[PDB]
Nucleic acid binder design. Structure first.
Ligand SMILES: *O[C@H]1[C@@H](O)[C@H](n2cnc3c(=O)[nH]c(N)nc32)O[C@@H]1COP(=O)(O)OP(=O)(O)OP(=O)(O)O
Lengths: 340, 906
DNA sequence: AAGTATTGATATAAGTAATAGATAATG
DNA sequence: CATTATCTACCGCAATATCAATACTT
């Protein structure tokens, strides 16, 4: 029974900091019907949901109206947006909080010690049915936050100590094309490799139908996203956005060594693998030639490799006796002899 | 017979490093094959020899391929391969030099470049390739000059240099081999294996690839050793024979090594102007001053050298010696499930530990190198040829061992010539010892009393440097204080002080010579009396006064309960405030002053480690005090800044005929230039750099082209003109003082503001320096600079906007419309410039009839030069003539009054 | 017209969100 | 009008691989 805000109230807001929000209730209803979150959470009445960068709050209001959760929390730091949300959602069971989701200390303070929001830990076999995290990172200058959250998927530390929690992400289309890539595509990168290793993602919505060529044809015809137009997002100046669903999966490898080997191996992403190995360390070319019995893997560029081949190469890297230490891999700008 | 004996050694010490290195480790192979199979650092030299002997065939094969490919002359059908295409690019260059020399040059450069460029265990590949190419081209130049003298492009492009460097570095990488020992983690079995010594790789920093070369830990294990001096020999080192005096900019300094008078880093305009000045002959005084600076003899302090050697061989962490450590101490890794903030903190700690460890290793290696040079030059007399930088200040040609180094290098140096103390030598040695202990506000008698108070401590610290009270350690200049204590112990052993022959230079310095020049130029009584230009009873400390003012400001601001204010209310010090003020008067920024004050107060640790926040408010207080304290210097530097802006935002009228057409605004190529009172031309080198990805064998480096003509960095010109002018005046005064002292026969050497000589001749030197300051500053240098700029930049036009509604502006609009029909096309500011240029060319015609007709012609700028109020009145773009501002008014203060001052230099 | 080399543009990593202090450029 | 790096002077340091468009020769 929460009041859904309108386009006239959205237009009143002045600063958006590059964040763009979808405001069409019909499109939101279609998106929620496609998601069918009641299927995963058999009892969403007791479910508790947290929102990162809520903004307009249309999605929060529609979610609460449709599902009636137990305790709903919002974390917004933008000033004008905070006053808008606070003014609108007065006298309602929905909660509003003023904290910046960028700082890890904010999460630590919220969950660990102050304990306003207390999720429950589940096993790693199935998705946590009592914790849902929805975030909006549509801002153009904050892709590093998304990459850090994926690294947190890998490290099982930030918010995933509670188990496998589903993520709904409003986030730009360019990073979506990079992240949802497949082997051989020109947009393949460490974003895509990390996504493949640590989670499974399905595209749910898109802002411009022209951008669907960048994605994979089989993947898009499987997902069947809900295509809309640039009108339904209020700030039209920005680039088209996309909605993705992130589900953590089980992984069996050493994250640090896999990270090092992928990052150093895939720099020369369009070089045959029989040449790119010598940059892993001294004698790496000879060692990997000796330990790689397959002659079909020695002519595939790192862009064409998949997470399974990368894990296999990580295993060989660990079995290497003479491996360079991965901790001493950086450049120090503070140190400079600079003798006269 | 000392000169002839040292002459042979210098010719030996000037031997080609490539030839000696070829013979050196070739010899080391003979003992290895006789003694037995080992891997000691003599076998490191053996490994270098093996690398050379296996690399030479590859270079020979490459030369053969290039020679065979260049034989034909049809480029279309030749070199269809990409590799064979670049052979036409580089091959005609490699065939000049001996391949063996080339190989040894590559190996030596790669060894020298290690642990440089921010890489933990290697060097950036761009630096490596360009440095190898530069070394090869320098060897080529030396060989060419020598063979031309014997028999009785000119500048290598940086792209070709990088290509050659990359080719040779890769070809050495493919050859270098070293053996490493390790265990495998399947069975924990210790095994051995050989690996290539170098491995090219990439790294990241804030999202950017860095092509880095990596040197094996086994190699580093020996490259850290004290045999680094044997494996790699310096090219420039202190001389034993008298240097050739400065006459021609292309011939001087070293007997066999050519050097330029100026250290022109990356600009040819400074070189051209210096060459023009040298050809004209206006810098004979500069030549004389440099000869005087570089003709004095030095020798190593044997006793202090012995003490330093014992302390270094002990291995413990001394005052400035870092010590000896073999492996890093990294804290235990946190659990992988810990918070990302904790993980980031741990990674920051690891980076800090690696930084500290690398810096300590570098300090230890540099100190070992310095002590090796000192031991190799023990007892003998050593000479320091001196070069000059563009801004006019003097520097030696020995970067490793020189008196401009740290306290160790200064204390290890004394004058080879000795002079009797005389009536004032003991007094001035005592003054010098008092100076070395941080007390200066006290007069000369009080300094003598302070020195006389501690004879027992001097005797202890001299009879036994270590294993005692060690009073010399608690001195601001420990090693120099130790040498001074030695000499006072010697003189107090004698019953007659005035008969001792001494070698210790005495420090005489002028506190903030830049502030002295400010006060002198502005004629400010307040600044002069604060800086002790006016004679007084006791020295006055501008640093102490401004520090008291900052204490007052912090007392005022401490009412906010600030912890930093509470702590530093009684802890604001002369040193911190002096390091802030000396640069501030020079024109430092807020962040620069913050850096300096935080660096100076960080060892005190009275506040937290992150004292930047506190030092922000401290610097605010310092600036608040200085704004009220100094006004004449501020006005002078503002006039310099306004002149810099006007010169930078100006276009000459001889740029072209029509236009550059590169955008609306033609590029700015005007740099601030003037002439020092000794005739030397000073040119600001600041310009923009255009870096392009240059493909090489290893990778595509990211380098610029200094030979390309680029615009001028206006911000850098503004920031550089005032300090460059001030320090040029300071160095000119130093050069004149040195020339006069050398004429009088003294032993003179100096480090910028401070001047060095024996204690007996200090009074004569002081009189000479007062006289030379008076002689140099008798003229109004600010005014003379104004006429110099007026004469140099008379035919210049600015660029600026103007109001559309200005009555004169509509006249400019019509003249633009008038010019369009006269030219026949659309009018432009460039067309206006061309019309102004041709009008000045008309005035150049000696025909009087053409002059009056030329005067009859009207140009847009010609309208402005007739006008005299449009600039003050100030849309549309307009052309304004270059009108430099009026000089600030000069106060009344007699220059010569400082001749009676006593604490001008002390 | 069809190759083909040149020239330009873009992503990389993953807390410098580690300063209002003060400011001259930018589009 | 907010942004956007930017910060005394010197005295031997701050990026690279890939992909798309375009124009140039053949
Ligand atoms: O001790 C110094 C010094 O030996 C060396 N170093 C760093 N920069 C320069 C330089 O520009 N010119 C010369 N001749 N030597 C240089 O590195 C050491 C740096 O350690 P510090 O922490 O003591 O110096 P820091 O850079 O932090 O302060 P500062 O050099 O700006 O004053």
């Amino acid at each position: 029974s929460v009041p859904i805000p309108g386009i006239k109230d959205i237009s009143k807001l002045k600063f958006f900091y590059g964040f763009k929000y979808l405001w069409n209730p019909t499109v939101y209803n279609k998106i929620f019907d496609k998601l069918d979150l009641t299927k995963t959470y058999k009892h969403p009445e007791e479910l508790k949901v947290l929102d990162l960068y809520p903004g307009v709050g249309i999605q929060s209001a529609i979610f609460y109206n449709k599902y009636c959760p137990r305790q709903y929390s919002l974390l917004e730091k933008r000033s004008s947006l905070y006053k808008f949300l606070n003014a609108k959602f007065e006298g309602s069971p929905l909660q509003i909080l003023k904290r910046d989701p960028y700082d890890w200390s904010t999460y630590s303070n919220l969950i660990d010690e102050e304990r306003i929001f207390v999720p429950e830990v589940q096993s790693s076999d199935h998705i946590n049915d009592k914790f849902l995290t929805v975030a909006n990172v549509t801002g153009e200058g904050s892709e590093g936050l998304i990459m850090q959250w994926l690294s947190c998927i890998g490290n099982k530390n930030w918010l995933y100590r509670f188990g496998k929690v589903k993520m709904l992400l409003w986030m730009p289309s360019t990073t979506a094309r990079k992240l949802l890539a497949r082997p051989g595509m020109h947009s393949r990168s460490k974003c895509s490799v990390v996504r493949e290793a640590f989670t499974d993602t399905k595209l749910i919505a898109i802002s411009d139908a022209n951008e669907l060529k960048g994605f994979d044809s089989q993947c898009i015809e499987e997902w069947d996203p809900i295509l809309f137009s640039a009108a339904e997002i209020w700030p039209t100046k920005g680039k088209p956005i996309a909605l993705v669903e992130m589900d953590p999966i089980d992984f069996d490898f050493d994250v640090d060594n896999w990270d090092y080997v992928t990052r150093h191996l895939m720099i020369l992403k369009r070089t045959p693998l029989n040449t790119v190995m010598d940059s892993l360390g001294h004698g790496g070319q000879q060692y990997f030639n000796s330990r790689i019995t397959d002659k079909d893997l020695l002519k595939k560029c790192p862009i064409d490799l998949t997470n399974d081949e990368f894990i296999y190469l990580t295993k060989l890297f660990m079995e290497w006796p003479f491996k360079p230490d991965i901790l001493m891999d950086f450049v120090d700008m503070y140190q400079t002899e600079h003798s006269g | 017979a000392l000169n002839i004996f040292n002459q042979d050694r210098q010719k030996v010490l000037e031997n080609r490093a490539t030839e000696a290195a070829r013979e050196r480790w070739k010899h080391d192979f003979e003992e290895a094959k006789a003694r037995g199979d080992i891997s000691i650092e003599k076998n490191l030299n053996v490994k270098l020899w093996k690398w050379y002997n296996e690399m030479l065939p590859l270079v020979k094969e490459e030369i053969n391929h290039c020679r065979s490919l260049l034989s034909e002359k049809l480029s279309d059908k030749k070199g269809l391969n990409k590799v064979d295409t670049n052979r036409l690019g580089y091959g005609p260059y490699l065939t000049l030099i001996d391949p063996g020399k080339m190989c040894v040059i590559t190996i030596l450069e790669l060894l020298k470049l290690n642990s440089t460029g921010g890489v933990i265990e290697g060097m950036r590949t761009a630096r490596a390739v360009i440095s190898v190419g530069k070394a090869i081209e320098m060897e080529f130049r030396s060989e060419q000059v020598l063979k031309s003298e014997s028999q009785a492009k000119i500048l290598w492009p940086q792209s070709i240099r990088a290509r050659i460097g990359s080719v040779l570095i890769s070809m050495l990488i493919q050859v270098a081999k070293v053996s490493v020992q390790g265990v495998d983690p399947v069975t924990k079995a210790k095994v051995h294996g050989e690996a290539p010594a170098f491995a090219h790789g990439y790294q990241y920093h804030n999202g950017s690839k860095l092509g880095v070369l990596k040197i094996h830990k086994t190699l580093i294990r020996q490259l850290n050793g004290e045999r680094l001096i044997a494996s790699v020999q310096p090219q420039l080192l202190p001389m034993l024979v008298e240097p050739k005096p400065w006459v021609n900019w292309r011939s001087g300094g070293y007997h066999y090594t050519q050097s330029t008078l100026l250290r022109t880093k990356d600009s040819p305009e400074q070189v051209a102007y210096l060459k023009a000045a040298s050809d004209n002959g206006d810098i004979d005084r500069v030549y004389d001053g440099l000869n005087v600076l570089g003709r004095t003899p030095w020798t190593v302090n044997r006793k202090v050298f012995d003490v330093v050697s014992q302390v270094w061989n002990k291995g413990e962490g001394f005052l400035d010696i870092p010590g000896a450590q073999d492996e890093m101490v990294l804290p235990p890794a946190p659990p992988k499930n810990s918070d990302p903030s904790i993980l980031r903190a741990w990674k920051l700690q690891v980076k800090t530990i690696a930084n500290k460890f690398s810096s300590d290793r570098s300090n230890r290696c540099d100190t070992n190198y310095k002590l090796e040079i000192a031991r190799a030059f023990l007892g003998e007399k050593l000479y320091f040829p001196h070069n000059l930088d563009f801004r006019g200040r003097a520097y030696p040609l020995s970067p490793h061992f020189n008196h401009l180094g740290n306290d160790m290098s200064r204390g290890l140096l004394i004058f080879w010539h000795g002079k009797k103390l005389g009536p004032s030598g003991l007094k001035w040695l005592k003054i010098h010892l008092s100076n070395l202990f941080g007390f200066d506000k006290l007069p000369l008698k009080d300094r003598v009393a302070f020195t006389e108070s501690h004879l027992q401590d001097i005797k202890d610290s001299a009879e036994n440097p270590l294993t005692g009270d060690r009073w010399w350690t608690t001195a601001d200049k420990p090693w120099q204080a130790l040498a001074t204590c030695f000499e006072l112990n010697e003189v107090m052993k004698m019953d007659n002080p005035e008969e001792f022959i001494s070698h210790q230079p005495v420090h005489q310095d002028g506190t903030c010579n830049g502030l002295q020049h400010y006060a002198a130029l502005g004629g400010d009584v307040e600044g002069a009396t604060q800086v002790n230009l006016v004679p007084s009873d006791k020295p006055q400390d501008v640093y102490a006064h401004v520090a008291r003012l900052v204490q007052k400001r912090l007392e005022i601001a401490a009412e906010k309960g600030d912890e930093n204010a509470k702590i530093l209310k009684d802890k604001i010090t002369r040193k911190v405030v002096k390091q802030t003020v000396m640069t501030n008067v020079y024109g430092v920024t807020y962040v620069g002053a913050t850096f300096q004050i935080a660096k100076q107060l960080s060892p005190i640790f009275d506040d937290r480690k992150e004292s930047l926040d506190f030092s922000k408010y401290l610097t605010k207080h310092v600036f608040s005090a200085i704004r009220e304290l100094f006004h004449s210097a501020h006005l002078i530097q503002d006039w310099l800044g306004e002149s810099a802006k006007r010169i930078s935002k100006s276009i000459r009228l001889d740029v072209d005929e029509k236009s550059f057409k590169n955008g609306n605004k033609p590029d700015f190529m005007s740099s601030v230039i003037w002439t020092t009172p000794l005739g030397l031309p000073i040119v600001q080198p600041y310009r923009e750099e255009s870096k392009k990805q240059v493909e090489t064998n290893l990778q595509t480096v990211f380098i610029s082209d200094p030979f390309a003509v680029n615009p001028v960095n206006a911000r850098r010109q503004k920031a550089g003109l005032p300090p460059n002018f001030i320090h040029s005046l300071d160095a000119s005064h130093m050069l004149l003082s040195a020339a006069e002292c050398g004429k009088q026969g003294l032993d003179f050497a100096s480090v910028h503001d401070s001047y060095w000589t024996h204690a007996s001749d200090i009074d004569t030197m002081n009189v000479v320096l007062r006289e030379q300051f008076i002689k140099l500053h008798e003229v109004d240098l600010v005014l003379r600079l104004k006429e110099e700029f007026d004469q140099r930049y008379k035919n210049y036009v600015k660029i600026g906007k103007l109001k559309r509604s200005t009555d004169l502006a509509q006249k400019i609009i019509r003249i633009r419309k008038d010019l369009s029909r006269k030219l026949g096309r659309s009018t432009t500011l460039a067309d206006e410039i061309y019309f102004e240029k041709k009008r000045q060319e008309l005035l150049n015609s000696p025909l009087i009839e053409d002059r009056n007709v030329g005067e009859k012609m009207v140009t847009t700028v010609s309208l402005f030069e007739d006008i005299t109020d449009l600039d003050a009145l100030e849309g549309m773009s307009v052309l304004l003539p270059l009108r430099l501002p009026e000089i600030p008014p000069k106060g009344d203060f007699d220059v010569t009054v400082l001749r009676n001052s006593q604490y001008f230099f002390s």
